Amino acid sequence: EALGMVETKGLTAAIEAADAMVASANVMLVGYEKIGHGLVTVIVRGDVGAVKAATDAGAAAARNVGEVKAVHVIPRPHTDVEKILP
Amino acid sequence: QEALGMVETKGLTAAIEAADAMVASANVMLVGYEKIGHGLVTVIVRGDVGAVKAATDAGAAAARNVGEVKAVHVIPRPHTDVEKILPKGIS
Amino acid sequence: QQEALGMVETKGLTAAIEAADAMVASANVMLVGYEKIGHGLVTVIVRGDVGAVKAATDAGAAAARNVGEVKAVHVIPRPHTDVEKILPKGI
Amino acid sequence: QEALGMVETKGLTAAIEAADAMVASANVMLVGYEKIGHGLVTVIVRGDVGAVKAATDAGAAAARNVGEVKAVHVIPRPHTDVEKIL
Amino acid sequence: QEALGMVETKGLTAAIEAADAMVASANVMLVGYEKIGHGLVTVIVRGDVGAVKAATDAGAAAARNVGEVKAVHVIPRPHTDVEKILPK
Amino acid sequence: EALGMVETKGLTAAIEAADAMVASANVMLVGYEKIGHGLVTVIVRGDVGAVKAATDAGAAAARNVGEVKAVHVIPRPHTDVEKILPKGIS
Ligand SMILES: [K+]
Q: Boundaries of each BMC domain copy (chain A)?
């Protein structure tokens, strides 16, 4: 499964990002992470294509509410990565 | 399936003012506050969409007289469960 | 005889402690507690009759300003039941 | 009852130096440290008004050679609600 | 000889990309991530010095295409207790 | 026992300081403390001579990785080191 991230400045934009992403059935919300400086990351998993479309939609929705700081898809995460994940 | 309303401010004082106006202005329940650093605080309420829209408008308007409002937003119908789309530890 | 919440928000803890002590000096106001949101921002919260809370928060802000930086000062008149209900969990 | 003294520094290293200088005289009690972010750390002591005045003078004097002093303050007669934030 | 490798970013997405690139590019183990606030995130790996050097270079390069890298560093370490210096 | 401190902007510089500190002298790592603004304080303990040598080395090493904000040695803490240290570091 692929990993998708949308990172915003502001939690309100992050929640909007999350809601837009989980709107399609084959995308799973992994969780939120806060790292300070107002930066909040929403993490999802699913088929690569679904995650690409999802993160694009999440960034698109979020940018109307607040600031998008990063948008990224990892099609094939290496397995150790699952330890830093929520 | 209940709507979510959010007001995000710089500073806690403006957030508490938002919260007070939000729950005073409509039939909404205060979900909680979240702090995300850089002095930013998000106030979250839930209820029927009409109440949440009215509450959030009220919250944003009141807060601006107290501090800086950074974001204002309503999600009328969350796709996932309301407890699912929210960050842990808020309620 | 309607209750109010009064807030003084400072950058720096010493100024907040000074605000709290100055506010509770009048036998008419109760200290609810302090809240931290990071970035050096500290909010001191009191409750009591509205008039008392206005005078208290004025006095608290004035005292705090001689010690450090005040970022916000605000009074919220509140409903009879559940006056502290809008407050963040942990104060 | 007892006086309250505070030395607030930018940096933990300076607060610890402040703390060590304050507890050097025997009738001064270290209440503790508080962190509020932005690098700000407050050292809080208690004792007789005079001991606390001399203690906070000394703590600030020591701290300022290590980092920046942001606040130095004595409350000779704290109202007894204040013991809640401490 | 054992070594600790670190990539420190402003932003989490860049850190996750660094972590993934590091364990993909060399024979290193992900120890974990640390947050210190202010948006600063440190990803830490472990392995032999050569591998860690390759991993952190690759991790830093990948992270820079996603967000901001603040520091990249390799610490060669003693035989025993290599992780002892790490935060809890 | 003496206390040594190196305070940096960034965790990477702090961990580098910690490594140089323990490698350069007979000092024990007490822990790390984060105080906001990206600031991290690394604290060690040992005899004054070791702590002095360690903190100098730690500061020098950290400066190659990031910015050092404070470097300080307390040869003789008045109260035992456990009393002046913040709760949660050790
Ligand atoms: K699009």
A: 2-86
